[PDB]
Scaffold this active site. Sequence first.
Site, mmCIF file in Angstrom:
data_model
loop_
_atom_site.group_PDB
_atom_site.id
_atom_site.type_symbol
_atom_site.label_atom_id
_atom_site.label_comp_id
_atom_site.label_asym_id
_atom_site.label_seq_id
_atom_site.Cartn_x
_atom_site.Cartn_y
_atom_site.Cartn_z
ATOM 1 N N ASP A 479 -6.853 -27.426 -14.323
ATOM 2 C CA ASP A 479 -5.475 -28.030 -14.220
ATOM 3 C C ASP A 479 -4.475 -27.387 -15.063
ATOM 4 O O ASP A 479 -4.583 -26.689 -15.998
ATOM 5 C CB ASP A 479 -5.727 -29.514 -14.214
ATOM 6 C CG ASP A 479 -4.666 -30.233 -13.408
ATOM 7 O OD1 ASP A 479 -3.554 -30.422 -14.026
ATOM 8 O OD2 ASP A 479 -4.763 -30.547 -12.250
ATOM 9 N N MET A 480 -3.239 -27.721 -14.988
ATOM 10 C CA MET A 480 -1.947 -27.569 -15.495
ATOM 11 C C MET A 480 -1.011 -28.377 -15.276
ATOM 12 O O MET A 480 -0.622 -28.855 -14.010
ATOM 13 C CB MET A 480 -1.567 -25.955 -15.427
ATOM 14 C CG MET A 480 -0.799 -25.430 -16.408
ATOM 15 S SD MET A 480 0.846 -25.769 -15.944
ATOM 16 C CE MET A 480 1.459 -24.464 -14.770
ATOM 17 N N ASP A 549 0.049 -32.771 -4.232
ATOM 18 C CA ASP A 549 -0.379 -34.185 -4.603
ATOM 19 C C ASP A 549 0.695 -35.084 -3.798
ATOM 20 O O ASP A 549 0.795 -36.395 -3.931
ATOM 21 C CB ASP A 549 0.279 -34.744 -5.986
ATOM 22 C CG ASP A 549 -0.670 -33.962 -6.961
ATOM 23 O OD1 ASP A 549 -1.936 -33.878 -6.836
ATOM 24 O OD2 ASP A 549 -0.342 -33.784 -8.249
#
Lengths: 742, 737, 254, 234
Positions: A479-480, A549
Amino acid sequence: AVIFHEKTKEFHIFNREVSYLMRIMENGQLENLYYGKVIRDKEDFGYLHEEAMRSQMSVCIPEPGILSMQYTRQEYPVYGTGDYRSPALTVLQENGSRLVDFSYVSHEIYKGKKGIPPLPSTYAESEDEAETLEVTLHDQVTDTDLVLTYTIYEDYPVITRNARFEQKGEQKIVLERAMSASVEFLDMDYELVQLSGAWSRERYVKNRKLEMGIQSVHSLNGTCGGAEHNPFIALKRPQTTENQGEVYGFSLVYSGNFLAQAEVSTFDMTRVMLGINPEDFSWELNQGESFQTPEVVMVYSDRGLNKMSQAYHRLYRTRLMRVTWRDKARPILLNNWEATYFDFNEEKILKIAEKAKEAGVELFVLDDGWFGARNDDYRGLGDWYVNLEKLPDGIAGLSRKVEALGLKFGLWVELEMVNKDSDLYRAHPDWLIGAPDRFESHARHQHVLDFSRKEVVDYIYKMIAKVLRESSISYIKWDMNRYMTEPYSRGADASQQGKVMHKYILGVYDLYTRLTTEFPEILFESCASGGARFDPAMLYFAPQTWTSDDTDASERTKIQYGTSYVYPVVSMGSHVSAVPNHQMHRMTPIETRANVAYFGTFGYELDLNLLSEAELESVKKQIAFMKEYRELIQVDGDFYRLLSPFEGNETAWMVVAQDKSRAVAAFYQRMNKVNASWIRFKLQGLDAGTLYEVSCDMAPSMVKTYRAYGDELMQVGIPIDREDLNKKGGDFASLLYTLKKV
Amino acid sequence: AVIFHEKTKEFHIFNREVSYLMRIMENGQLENLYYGKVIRDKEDFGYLHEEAMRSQMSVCIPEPGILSMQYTRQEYPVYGTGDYRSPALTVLQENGSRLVDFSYVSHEIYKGKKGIPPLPSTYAESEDEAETLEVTLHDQVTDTDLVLTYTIYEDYPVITRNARFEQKGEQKIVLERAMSASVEFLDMDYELVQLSGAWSRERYVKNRKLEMGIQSVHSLNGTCGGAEHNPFIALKRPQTTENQGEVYGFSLVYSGNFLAQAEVSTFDMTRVMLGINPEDFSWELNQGESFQTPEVVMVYSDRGLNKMSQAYHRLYRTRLMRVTWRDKARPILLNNWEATYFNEEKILKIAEKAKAGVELFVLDDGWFGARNDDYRGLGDWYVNLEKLPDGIAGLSRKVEALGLKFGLWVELEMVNKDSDLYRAHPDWLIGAPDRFESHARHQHVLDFSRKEVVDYIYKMIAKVLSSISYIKWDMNRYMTEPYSRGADASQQGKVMHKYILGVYDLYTRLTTEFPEILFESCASGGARFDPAMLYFAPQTWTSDDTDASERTKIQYGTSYVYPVVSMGSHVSAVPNHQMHRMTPIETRANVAYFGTFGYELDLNLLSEAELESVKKQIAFMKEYRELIQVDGDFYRLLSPFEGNETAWMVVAQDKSRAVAAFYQRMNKVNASWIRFKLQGLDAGTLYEVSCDMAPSMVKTYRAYGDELMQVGIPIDREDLNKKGGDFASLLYTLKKV
Amino acid sequence: AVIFHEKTKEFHIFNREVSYLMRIMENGQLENLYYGKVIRDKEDFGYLHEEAMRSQMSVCIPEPGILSMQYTRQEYPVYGTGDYRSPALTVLQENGSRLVDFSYVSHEIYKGKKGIPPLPSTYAESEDEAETLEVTLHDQVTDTDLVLTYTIYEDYPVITRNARFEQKGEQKIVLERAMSASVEFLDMDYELVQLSGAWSRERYVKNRKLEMGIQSVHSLNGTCGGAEHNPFIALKRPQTTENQGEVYGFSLVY
Amino acid sequence: YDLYTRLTTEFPEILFESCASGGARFDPAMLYFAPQTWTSDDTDASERTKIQYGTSYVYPVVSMGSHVSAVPNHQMHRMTPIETRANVAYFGTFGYELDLNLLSEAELESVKKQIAFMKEYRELIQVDGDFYRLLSPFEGNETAWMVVAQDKSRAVAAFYQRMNKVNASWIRFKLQGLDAGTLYEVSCDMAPSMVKTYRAYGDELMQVGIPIDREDLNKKGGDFASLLYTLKKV
C-alpha cells in the site's frame, strides 16, 4: 523489418500493419517522413521533405543553402540553433552555455528486444518477436554520446522508443531536461484524448480540440503519478468512433513525475512529447557515467478505439506480466477491512473466515491493525513485528489455523511511511525526507521514508523478509497513502539534489526485485488509496491493482469504462460491498453489484454472517458463476465497449472467445424512465454465420432463451422490455446475457 | 480607495466599476476572496474561505489545524509545500534546495504611482488619479525580501500589478523563474481568447474552451515578441459577443520572451499567469542586489469586448504615450520603398510631384555604405557618395526647400559580414566558440547586452542626425546562439534580458537628446507590436501586406488592445506585390483611413482619373484626421471572422459626429436585404446620414438615433456593383442636425 | 429474392446488399420489421414486433387485444383510426366522411418490372435483373382497391415503390391526399440532407439535425419543381463521411 | 410529357436539351426524354465549383451542361484564368459560348489544345468512370473531384482554389479509388500562366498523397488558380 537504403540514407520500419520513415538531413540530425498505415517499400522517398524560402528564417547550413529547423519534422529537437518551438533536450556545460549539436555517426541493426537495466520494460521471449535499430550520435565540443533505439513488434502494431546518454570526455554536464519521445505531424485536424479524475473518480475520458499553442498533462506528486492525470495520450480524428476511424496512442512506462505535451504552431504543425517532468530534475553526469530514460509504447489503429485497446491489453497481458502469473486465473478472496475496521480480534477473524469457507471463498486476507500499537491511525507504522497483546499467538498461528480450515492467508503492508509514535523515529530520526528549518508536512498523520539511500532499504528488507519467512503468507497487499513534500535528501552533496525524486522511485523498484526473487510463490497487489499509482509499470512486479476505494456499482461502471482504454481486464480489482454505501450512501441490488464486479478480479468486502438466506444463496450462486466463467473473462477473450456512461445513462460491455464460440455481455442503466422508446441492444465482435443461443435469466429482485444467427445480433440486436428492468430494481438495473455456438 | 481591516486583517481595493479583495492567511501568505464588479464595503468578509477534510491532503500548519495550498486561492504560489501545481517563483540556494517560506511583515498605502527603474510602464500626472498598496514579505532562512505592488486607477476600471525582489543578506540566490502576477477564480466556464498569426498574417482572433490541464502561449525569440503570439489573453463568458456580457483582459508591458498560461485543476479551479519565459533565464542576485519584473495591466468589463477595448485605448493614449505627441495629429507621408527598391534627381521629382498634397517625405534603406543589395554592409552609417554627391544635408535641404519635411530609415543593431565594423570588431557579435552561427537575410545580430557597442553605434547615429523630423527604426531578424563573450559562466542566463534593456537605453538616450523627431517602430512588418515601445515610439508599422482585403482582417484583430492612431496604414500600387490582387482606389483609401494615412506609390505612372481621386481623399483625411485619431471612440460592428463582411465606426465624445464603413469580400447574386445597425449614438437625437453613391450623387436623409440602432441603414446590392465587384466598400458620414 | 412465409405471413425482400422485412398484422394493414443490411433467412421473426400497455392508448381490435397504431411501424398510414401523426392517404365520401380501412386480400410475385403507363420510370432489359411484389388491399363500405408495388433490383442496393388506386364500386370518392411511399424507423440519431438555392445559386448542400416535430422541403410552383428545393432527401449518421458511415437516400421521379 | 413523347417518337435521331431558366426543372423525370440539362446560367468557374458539387449527389456527370464564357463575367463581374474555366468545364458536357474572333493565338492556341484534350478524354469522363468527391467547397476553400476507370488503369484529378494564402502550410493531396499495389505514372502540366512526371504505388497516393507547392499555384493565377492531374498504369 528495418531496411536501410545507402544512397538516400533512409530507415524503413515496417511490419504487416504500420510503417515508419526517417532520413539523414544535411546535418547529423534525423527527420520524420511518414508514420502510419503500411506502404510498399520503394527507394528514393526524397521527393518528400519540401523546403522553400520565407521571411526572417534562420538557417543552420553554409552560405548558398537555406534550411531552417522551424519547418522540418525532426526527431529529437533542440533549442538554440534556429528553432523557436519547445525543445526536448537541454544540457549545461562548464562555460554557462546550453548550446549543443549532435551529429550522426553510425547505426546497428538486430533482432529481438534487449533490456534496460535500471527500469522495467516489455520484453520478447523469442528471437522472432521483434526487431530493433540503434542510431548513435556524437558531440565534439563536449565528448557526449547519444543513442536512440527503435523496436518494432512482429504480430503486433506496436513501436517502442527510448534514449540513452553517455559521457566519455573530461567535463561534467548537467541534464536539465531529457524527454523520451518526440513525434511530429503536418496537419492539425485531430482531437486529444486524456484520462482525468480524482480520488474515487479516477480516469474519466475527456476530449479536446487541437489549437495553436501548447496543451499538456503533467504530474508533480513525487511519489506517484497521482489520481489527477494518468500517463496516456491519444490523438483521434473528429469523425472516429469506437468502430471505425484512425487513432494514435502513446503510453509511458514510469511511476513518478511525468509530462505529456502537444504543441501546435502557426503553420499548422503538431508535435507530441512524452517524458519525465523537468521541474526539479537536473542530472549531473561526470566522466564515464551514463543515463537511461523510460520507454514509450506507440500504437496505431485504423478501425477505432477498440482495436487499439485490444492491442494494449494483449501486449500488457503477455509480454509485460511475469511468466508465473501470466496465463493463470485469479483467486476469490475476502477482505475484512470494511466489515470490522480497526476493532477486531483473533476469534472474530476466525468466525468470519469460518463463514467464508462455507460460502466458497478461496482465501482470506487480513487488513490493517496487526502490528505496533494501531489503536488509531496515529501510531507506529515503521514497527513491522506482530502485536502480541491483541494477537496472543502471532501471525504463524493464524496462518496455520486458516490453512487447516482450508483457506490461504494474506497480509497488508505499507513499507515506506512512518509516524511520530513508532520506534524508528526515536531510533533514527534523520531517515526522513526534508531540509533544515523546513516545516514537516503531515498527511493522515504520517511521513514519508527516504528510499534515496540503500541503508534504509536494507533495514526495511531485514524485517519484511523475516516476517514473511517464518509464516505461510501467499498474498501480500502493498500500500501507499501519501504525497511527497520537501524533496531533500540528507545523504547527498549539494550538487546531487536534482536526482532525489527520481532515485526514490528507483528505491521502490529494486526492493520489489528482492521480494519477488527470494519469494516467487507470493502474489502481489499494488494499492495507493485506490488507483493513484496505476500505470504500465508495476505490472512487471504486481500483476493487479486496487482500482479505487469507491466499490459503488453506479460509479465503478464509469471508472472501469475510463480505465479500460489502455489496461487489461485481469489487472482491475473489484469487490462486492455492503448495501448502504460508505461513499455515496446509496442503495443498490446485489445482482448489479455482482454484474459490475464480474469483469475484473472478483472478491468480497462485507460480512457473510450478517445477511439473509435469500441474499446468501444468491452469493453462493454468483460464486459458482464466477468459478465457471472466470477463465473466459480473464485469460482468453477480447473486451468490447458498446455504450458509454458519458453522453448517456446506459453502459454495455462484452467479452468474446478468440474462436468466437462463447461470449458474455452486460447492460446497465443509471436512472429510470417511463413511456420511453423501445430498445434494441446491438452487439459487436461476434461471428456472422454462426447460430448463437442467447440466454438470460429474469428472476425478480425464469429463463429466456432463443437462437439467432450472428449477423442478426450485429445489425438488429436483442429487444429489451423496460418492465423486466423494473422487476430487477428500477434505478440501477442490469441484465447479463450468455451465448454459445450450438 | 484602499481599506485595511486590521481586526480581521483584510485588504479591499474598490473603484466605480471593479473591486479586489485579499486576506492575510493564518500564515504570512495572501489569499484572494473576490475580484470583479464593484461590491459594497463591509467588515468581516471571512466566511468566504472554505476548508474541508479530504484524502491525500498535505497540511502546512501544526497538527490541530488543516490548510492545504492545493485547495486555496493564493496570489504568488510556490511549489514543494503541499501545492502540486506549477508555481510562480523558483530559486536555487547553495544547499541545493529549491524551497522557500516567504511570510508577511508590513504594508504601506500611498496615493500616486512610482516608476519601475530599468523598465517602462504607465504613469499618473497628479496624486488624484491612482492609489497604490505595497506589501512587504520576508524570508528568514535566507535573508531575502519581497515586495508586491497593486495600483488602482480612477475613472478607469484598470488594475496594475508588479513584484520585486531584494537580497539583503550574506548568501547568494538564483532566480530561475519569477512571474509578475497570478489570478485565481472558483469556476471554469470561460473561453480563452488569443491573437495568433504569422508574417503578413498578424494577430488573428482565436477562441479556445478551457478543459482540465494546461493551455498557454509562449515566445522564444530573444529579440522581439514574435509574429506568432502576442502578450494578451482574456477570459470571456460563452455568451458574450460585443454589447453584453462579462470579460477579463490581461496585458503585459514587455518586448522579449514571454509566457502566458491558464491551468485548470480537477476541482474546477483556474489559475492564470503571465511573465518572462523561464526557458534560459537564471538571474543571479548577489548581496545587496535587486530585481524588478515587468508590469501587468488588468481590465474588467460587464458590457463586452467593446467597453474593454475602449478602456484600453483611452488608457494607452493618455497615460502611456509621451506628452508632446499626446494631442498632435499624425501627418500624411510618402515612402519610396515599393516605387524604387534601391538616384538623387529621381528622389527630387517624386518629392515635388507629391508636394498633390503630401506633407513630408521619408528615405528608405540603401542610402549608406555600399548597400547595392541585401548583401552589403549594414555596419556603416555614413552617407554613400556615389548615389548622393551632396550627401544627406544637401538632399535634405533640396527637399525641405519646397515645404516638405524629411525623415530617414535606420536599422541600428544588425551587421553584415561585408562591413567596416566586422573588419574592426569581429568579436562584437552574438555567438559561442566552436559553434556555427546562423545566417538570416545575410545579416547577423549585435550584442546590446554590453555597453561599448551601444556607445559606438550612438556616436555614428547622433552625428548624421541634417534637418530631420522623422526616423523609421527597423529590425529584421531573430536571435540564435545566445552566448556572450564579455561574461563568465556565472552570468550566461542574463543575456536575453540585458539585450532588451540595452535596446531600451539607446531609445532613452536618443529620445532625450532629440525631442523634436517622431519615431516609428518596425520589425519586418510589426513583429514587435506590444504595449512597450509606445513609451518611446508613438506609432508602428503594423504589417507589410498593405492589401485592403487583408488589412481588413489584420486591423480588426489588432484593434482588440491597441489604439487606432498607432496603426500605420498606407496606399500601394494596384497589382499588390504580395497577393497579386486587383483593388480600386476608393476601397483602399477607405481601409487606410482608420489609422494613420500614408502612401507608398510613385504618383507617376498613375492615370489622370486617379490623380484627382488622390487629391480629394487627401483633403478628406485632412478634415477627419483629428476625429479618427485624437477624439474618438472605436466600435467594432461586424467581424471579418465568423462571416463575410466587416464594419467599423468612430464616434465623437459628446455624440455629435460619426464616421462608419462597410466592407464586403465576394460578390453575391440573388442575395437578401441588408440592414446596417450602428452603435454608440444618442437615441434622442436626429442626424443626417450621407454616402457618395458615385460609380467607379449623394443620398442624405435625416433620422433619429434609435432608428439607426434597432432598424438599421438599408444597403442596395446594386450600389455594390457600381463601386466595383469583389472588395467593394461604402463610407458614411453622420452629423447632428 | 422474394419469399413469403405462409405460417407467419412475412415477406422477405433481399439481394446481396440490402434487406426488407414485412409482416401482416392482425388487421389487414402491413407493418415494418427491418430495413437495412443483408440478413440470413430464418423461418420466423415475430418478437421483432413489440406491444405494451400505456395511458391514453386507443385500440383498433376487440377488447382482449392491445394493438395500437400510434406505436407501430406501418407501411401506409391513415388518420382517424388511432394514429395521431401525419397521414399518407385521404379520401372524401358522398356522406362527407374521411375514414377508410383497407385490409389485406391477396398478393402476387413475378420476375421483371411492369411500367406505370402515363408516367416515366426505370426499366429492365432481361428478366433476371429485378423482381416484383404486388399487394392488394380492399375497402368494403366503398368498393375500392389499393395496390402497393415493391421492386428490388440486382447488383445495386436499389428498391422502388409506388401505389395505384382503382374504383370498382358505384359511388364517388375524392382523393385529397395521396403520397407515394412511407418508411419508418425506431430511433432518431440522424441528420437530414437537402439541396437549397435560388437563381444562379442552385443546389447548395445543407445538413440539419433531427429534433422532435416535422421538417419538410416543398415546391408550389406548378410549372416546374423549382430552383429552391430539389425533389430528393437523405438520412445519415452523424459520424458519416464520404468514405465511412451509413446513409439512406430517397429520390422521387416527378 | 406526351408532347415530349410524340415529338421524340416521330424524330428519333435528334438530341433534346432541357432548360428551365437555368436548371429549375432538373428532376429524374426529365432524363427519360432529354438526356442532358443546362445546369445554371452563371457559367462562372468559382460558382460552378460549388454548384456542381451539390448537383453530383444524385445525377450523373453526363447530364451536367458546362460552357466557357466571356472572361469579364456577365453575372458575377469577375476575371478568372482561362485554364481554370476549362478545368471546371471539363467534368460535364464541354462547349463554348463566346465569339472566337476576339482572342489572340496566345489565347486561341490554348482553345485548340483544350478541344484536343476533351476529345481525347470524353469517353473516360462521361461513359466509363466512377465519380469520387475528395474535398468540399463547404467548410473550406478547396475543391477536388476525380474519375477512375472500372479497369482501374487510368484516372483524372483536379484541385481548385478560392483565395490565396501567403506564408501558409504545406499541402498533401490524398486521393482514393485506385488499387492497393499497382505502379502508377503521375503527370502534370506546368506553365507560367513544362511537365512533371513521377511514379508511385497505389497506396502511397492514398495514405500519403501528392505534394503541392504554393508558388506553383501563384504562377497560374494568384488569387484564383486550379491544377489538373493525369494518372496512367504503365
